[model samples]
Target chain A: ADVYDIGRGAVMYVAGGKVSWAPRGGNEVKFEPVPKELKLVANRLHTSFPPHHVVDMSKFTFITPGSGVSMRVEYQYGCLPADTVPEGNCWWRLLDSLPPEVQYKEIRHANQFGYQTKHGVPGKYLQRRLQVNGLRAVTDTHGPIVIQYFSVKESWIRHLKLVEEPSLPGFEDLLRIRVEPNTSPLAGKDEKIFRFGSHKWYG
Target chain B: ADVYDIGRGAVMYVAGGKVSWAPRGGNEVKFEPVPKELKLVANRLHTSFPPHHVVDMSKFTFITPGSGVSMRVEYQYGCLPADTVPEGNCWWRLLDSLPPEVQYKEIRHANQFGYQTKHGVPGKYLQRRLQVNGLRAVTDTHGPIVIQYFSVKESWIRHLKLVEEPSLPGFEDLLRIRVEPNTSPLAGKDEKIFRFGSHKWYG
Candidate 1:
């Protein structure tokens, strides 16, 4: 097992094909723990990507300290020969970068990009859901905060086509989830509002 | 002049009512400087919120080190009297959180939110532009990358209503802008594409 110190009481441990985090308490850097938010999503995607969040294990990947805060992670499902994608079979990726709202409209259009008819016989299918404060749903009215985030500097937005010449766009959809604050409305008045157009994600 | 240490060879200096950043070389942390990107926007908003980016100064705000990485800032234009907003008066804010691909469709709809007819006798007006690699334009096809970033945890999305009860919904608009890579297309293939759903800003 290998451990990396992320400074300020934070340390990342990698072992048994997983990654986990722990905060320092006094002299010893205690055993890492998974964030409640991370646990919720991991459990939800268990069927497709089983999570091993035991003592010190997680599916998330972060190459650097600052990268960890970025919080975005991708979970790949199915056989990854890696050298080359097999012709008869294909794979699916669960890209998680939580947005504020996920209109059902985008979900309805999701299949058009990763259609079984075109992208070979899929060993795994694409699925998505927005879990907010343990309560999962798809819409705008649910959460206390309603945000609209976007970024083009991201790497994935560039290679957005299945075919190069004709340019058949790849599978893409924005996942919107509301964050319901626990405090009373009046009590949360001083809450700093954010206008997020860019940020990171988790595994 | 007050200087705040952000560690790792980086320091933030606040002097003459502005903030600035600087990097460290070998020994001491040097004078902070404004980012080129910040300079561009500062120059753009000069007519309204004149920038003072000389030795050290910026309109941006960051209460903590982590907060500094969260590059979001607001520049208020027009009178900001200490006592009250005063009757028959108003102010304007230039919120910069750059997103990818500013669709003309949205730009066309921008005026509806901050209409001069409704939001008092406009003391100031909002004018937005996308500057990519020093060349400014407003469109998706112009840039090599196209992104759609969003967030709801942001504070501004709430309190969106104007007439509280009846809910007149305050002014809001997403500013989309593309980021072009300087390297050759083939050379930039290994670039880690991002799907930004949350992030920070500048003043």
Candidate 2:
């Protein structure tokens, strides 16, 4: 357990965007300089049962001295037609951070990394569901910047996969699941949308 | 801690999509029907730096009778001109699930829900990273019917936001964002691509 630290010069990797797991549009955070829509990426949820709510996100200290890696994920949901960001009282934030001198067992480990979370380890209350009237999810492993929520970088297209029973609240089966650019009633939309059984749907 | 038990028939809550500390799309499982993508949503990560990875996610136990909430997220990254999925060998999977009779001290507590990662309770090896070659991200924090990866009923468009910095790979200046039905130099290409900085980008 004591033998697993990401190390001083561990090759730092950073990727964003939805490819396989998320909607088609990938959220790969390339190295660069910009106005900083980091906040946009921060406060977003994919499209399904849709509604708009939330505008704030948890922050991150990317290059902390003794910290491995940490993230800040922000989220808000269940906003009726009229819910203000402040008073709707529906925002659960996550602020998780891990330190360099971490002392804990490798809860989950494989390859070179240890899937460990160092919460409640004294001096750092950087773990927990910061509920506001109750709302959201977040996770922080071994770093000062914890991963915030489920929302992607906001507004971009997304892909969704379904299994077993098709008839969920927001799904429909296509005549067939093909990967060519799309061509049907969505005609020339260049995406895929079909229907199988009572589960008639599209991604 | 005995009072932490959710108790029999306790009314539950559910939320989905990656907004907080989920894989990519926080698949918070709720209670529902037969069809299920829970497993698919359990393993996922995106790209930018390399090897798909996840930060930390909310925890849960769907059918555990009286218990807590959990999560699921999913995603993939950019594809090169010529890199088969097999040769890519670029995937680091998730392993988020704890034991039923788990026992550990509450690391952080604030509002109502506890910020948690119940790992390594001695005999219950449930706290280790659950890696398995290749897997995807999806949402599962609500019910048995998990929102698998992006393959979906399956056709949809996504939006992306840009910020201040420039030198960062795919973004630039004065490049105001816009949204319309779909009509451009590509004339009807569903994706968004606008000319701005050095190398005009697409999202």
Candidate 3:
């Protein structure tokens, strides 16, 4: 028998937050409009993947200034018979799935934050930064094919400026992508779209 | 002529705070006595050395659990000079002045706590698990030094216990050691002791 056995999978989703596009506008200014081109990119990824397997966006939430658009796509897999090996098997598998053209840079880890990596179209604008704050592949023992990914496109930024910024104060410029994973397995079921509100986002 | 100029001197007093001692009581329930020992061991190079020239402990203030001691001692043949070359020339001279049986151990940079074998001690004791959480040798331009030897033997166990039982509340058992050359210019001037209240001690 082999000393170790591992399995893997890939999942993607969308992330939305507020950001500021134009700086000249006064208090009347609001969230920046996410570029239409970016929305198309996000929609394409959502449709390309199997509907049942697509990541649940309602599980993610963020806070920002005015308007901006970005994507956070994560790919994860794990080893078989978790008891025999470490969770790192799944972590490494996720890293291996990156496209040959994609570049990995800026890595950090510690008790406060786990391993994290950022990727984007090579040699384009500032590459988006994605921080994997936590890992969960170790919970299941059946060695289920678990993969998780999320992406926020330019259109999401445009929607934030148009829909949420005008009424908010000091809502100017914001461009940041962060993933705060819920460590507790008991956290309720995943929702379809993460709504915006105080701490209680969804009903 | 040598490319670098140098001088030599002995280290008289290295002041450190949060002095503590725990005599072996049992596997648990260790007792830390109040008014910890504030002792200094000085070396006299030559027999003819005048009494007034010996290192003085009266000049520095000693803080302990219950009380403090302040004393000073002067030395003849002025302490070494600063900006000396060959880096450890002063240390070499200091070691040479010791009895033939007395040796100096070179503390490794990677493993900051232990000393070299020449100090006239068992190699195994030197290798034992000795670490001071709060204290460090300032003369160590390389890195931290693991505290293999202490003025008080019981203090070693106190420090080790603190490192092991991090879960215990109010366990302030960190210890540190600092080394400095007692040159005429630096003598009388105190080297900042590693403070106990700082995060560097527990962290």
Candidate 4:
């Protein structure tokens, strides 16, 4: 139902300086932004970042103005359980974004981010990071950063790294429908959670 | 011809009090390594750097570890004109690896990097960066001392901005079969360049 600008101004009604969009949740999350299990897993972690919301991959990248150093921001679940796997499963990528070389690797372990998933959480369901031969191939850092911008969404993913520039979809092979409203998440962010003159957007 | 290990051992050939990978040049780059244009750009800029390489796009990212200001590294034409691209044309995206905004907007200007396409050197037919709204749909900050790794194969250099536990790829998709041999390029680098004993590798 037209998710284009879904919660654009929803923050105006937040009170106690808590109208946050940084994973902090509200009943307003209809289509199930993030899995409840993931939330429970987040809650059981005994940490500050309890799953606020698990939105789809809305924004993320490592941009450079031709030189030294790059920064990455994962605004949404670029690969929700539905995008890349079966029920309730999610992953970044061993092939596409992780590697023999890379720009950045989103910290996967809760401990890596300073938290821990509960013990009883099953292995396959403990917000897991699978590795076979030192690889999860879930898109971390290793491969092309700028190309991911174009939706060549596989390869260090699961297929051959394809190039569709000028969109080599070929003029004859036309009409390539696309997803991803593709918008820039935030202009300036901090920990995906912060105070914004009373408006807070949590990561 | 085997750029595979071209300048790999060249750093060992250096004999000076200071010939930093920061800007060590001479016809010695004949090891089939990177370029002087790339190094010239790094040096002519005249500033403070941590002896990081400048290279790119293929795959680059900047991932933050929980909290702390992050750094970005840009790689230069990882391939160079003779290695890739047509003439001397080279470029990067305004999207992908950049964010919050940044400090790197590597001067794509001729006067900024030095070296002219003259003696009929081709009058700078480089892919100048264009700005419509300064809004590239991809995506940094600092105090973390991070740097962008760049390339040498002229335009479309393959880079992998990396973290310790990460990865990095190529342009075969562009039919751009590139091989960085993927070395760090800064073996015993320095603020001016460095040493690790008899084993040395300059930037």
Residue B96's lDDT within candidate 1 is 24
TM-score of each: 0.15, 0.16, 0.14, 0.14
- Candidate 2, residues B29-120, lDDT tens digits: the string is 21222123422222221111121222222321122211322111122332211211112111111111323222111111111232121111
Weakest ten-residue segment in model 4 chain B by summed lDDT: B194-203
- The alpha-carbon RMSD over the true interface for every model, in angstroms, is 18.0, 17.6, 34.5, 23.2
Model 2 Cα lDDT, one tens digit per residue, A1-203: 00000111111111233111121113322212212343223222221122211212221112222222212112222222211111211111111122222212111211123212111111111111212212212111222212111232221111223223223221222222322222223434444232111211111
CAPRI band for model 1:
incorrect
Off by over 4 Å in 1: A1-203, B1-103, B110-192, B201-203
Report the candidate with higher TM-score, 2 versus 4.
Answer: 2
Error of 4 at B101 (Å): 53
Q: Give candidate 4 regions above 4 Å deviation.
A: A1-108, A111-203, B1-37, B47-203
**Candidate 4's residue-wise lDDT over B112-203, tens digit each?**
55422211011122211222223211112211111121222221122222123122222221111111111234223321221111211011
Worst 10 residues of 2 chain A by lDDT: A1-10
What is every candidate's C-alpha DockQ against the true complex, given to 2 decimals?
0.01, 0.02, 0.00, 0.01
Go through the candidates in order and give each one's C-alpha lDDT. 0.26, 0.20, 0.22, 0.21
Q: Which whole-number lDDT from 0 to 100 does residue B66 have in model 2?
A: 18
For B103-202, candidate 3 gives per-residue lDDT tens digits of 3333333124422211122223322212121112233223232222112221111121212332222123234334433333432334443322211111
How does residue A177 of candidate 1 score in lDDT? 33
